Amino acid sequence: QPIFLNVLEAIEPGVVCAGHDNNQPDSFAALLSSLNELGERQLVHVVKWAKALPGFRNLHVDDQMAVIQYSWMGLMVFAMGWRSFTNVNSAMLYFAPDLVFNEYRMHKSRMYSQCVRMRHLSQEFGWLQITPQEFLCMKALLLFSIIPVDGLKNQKFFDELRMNYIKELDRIIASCSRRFYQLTKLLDSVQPIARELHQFTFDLLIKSHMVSVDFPEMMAEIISVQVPKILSGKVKPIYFHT
Numbered sequence: 340q341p342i343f344l345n346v347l348e349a350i351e352p353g354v355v356c357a358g359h360d361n362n363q364p365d366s367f368a369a370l371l372s373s374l375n376e377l378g379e380r381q382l383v384h385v386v387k388w389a390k391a392l393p394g395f396r397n398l399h400v401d402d403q404m405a406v407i408q409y410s411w412m413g414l415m416v417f418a419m420g421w422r423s424f425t426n427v428n429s430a431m432l433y434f435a436p437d438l439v440f441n442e443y444r445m446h447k448s449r450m451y452s453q454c455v456r457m458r459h460l461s462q463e464f465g466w467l468q469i470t471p472q473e474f475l476c477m478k479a480l481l482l483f484s485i486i487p488v489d490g491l492k493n494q495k496f497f498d499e500l501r502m503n504y505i506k507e508l509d510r511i512i513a514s515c516s517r518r519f520y521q522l523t524k525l526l527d528s529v530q531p532i533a534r535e536l537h538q539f540t541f542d543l544l545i546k547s548h549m550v551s552v553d554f555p556e557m558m559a560e561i562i563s564v565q566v567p568k569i570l571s572g573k574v575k576p577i578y579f580h581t
């Protein structure tokens with residue numbers, strides 16, 4: 340109904356295929372290379388989504404790219420959890436229409452423990468009865484949920500932007516106080532999942548040539564330049580709850 344939800348609903352990216360050959364057997368190299376390629380493809384959509392968000396041009400240009408390059412993992416995981424919930428009721432991880440992870444592929448990817456936590460996130464959309472509007476509002480907040488400890492180039496504009504995206508989530512929610520507690524808690528729970536994936540993908544990139552896993556260009560750069568800033572503690576998530 341407001342101008343805010345109109346925009347989020349209008350800019351929400353469509354379907355993104357991974358390009359996975361489902362005829363080949365489920366090897367560690369094949370699954371991860373297809374996930375990597377899906378990441379490269381989704382990263383193009385996340386950029387164009389982010390730039391079309393209300394007030395996103397208020398940020399400094401370096402801060403615009405920085406906030407995208409830090410928050411992409413959590414954003415994509417959260418959207419994937421939503422796809423998994425809506426399509427297959429959180430039974431499998433719906434990374435893309437041509438890349439759906441069953442229990443076997445959770446195991447063959449050597450990421451079973453991480454896939455379990457992502458499936459658990461997907462089940463929370465069902466357990467908490469999250470609406471599409473709450474999903475979109477929450478997802479938009481995740482873009483503004485990880486920053487350098489030293490701060491951004493223009494920190495005031497980020498703070499003002501983050502404040503307003505919190506306000507919009509509180510609005511579309513509305514002893515209802517428990518709701519906001521729960522949604523903030525669910526948003527916080529994305530961050531530990533994203534950190535495990537940051538560690539996994541970083542380790543995988545280092546050893547990629549040995550295990551024949553293919554990393555595309557933007558993924559290789561971001562995982563080698565931006566992700567280690569997060570893993571070294573220079574860049575950290577903004578939690579709601581301590």
Ligand SMILES: C[C@]12CCC(=O)C[C@@H]1CC[C@@H]1[C@@H]2CC[C@]2(C)[C@@H](O)CC[C@@H]12
Nearest residue numbers: 374375377378381415416419434536540
């Ligand atoms: C973001 C992606 C791809 C987009 C998505 O739907 C969620 C998914 C979560 C796991 C990521 C994957 C991109 C490729 C990664 C980073 C692998 O290198 C290891 C974990 C994978």
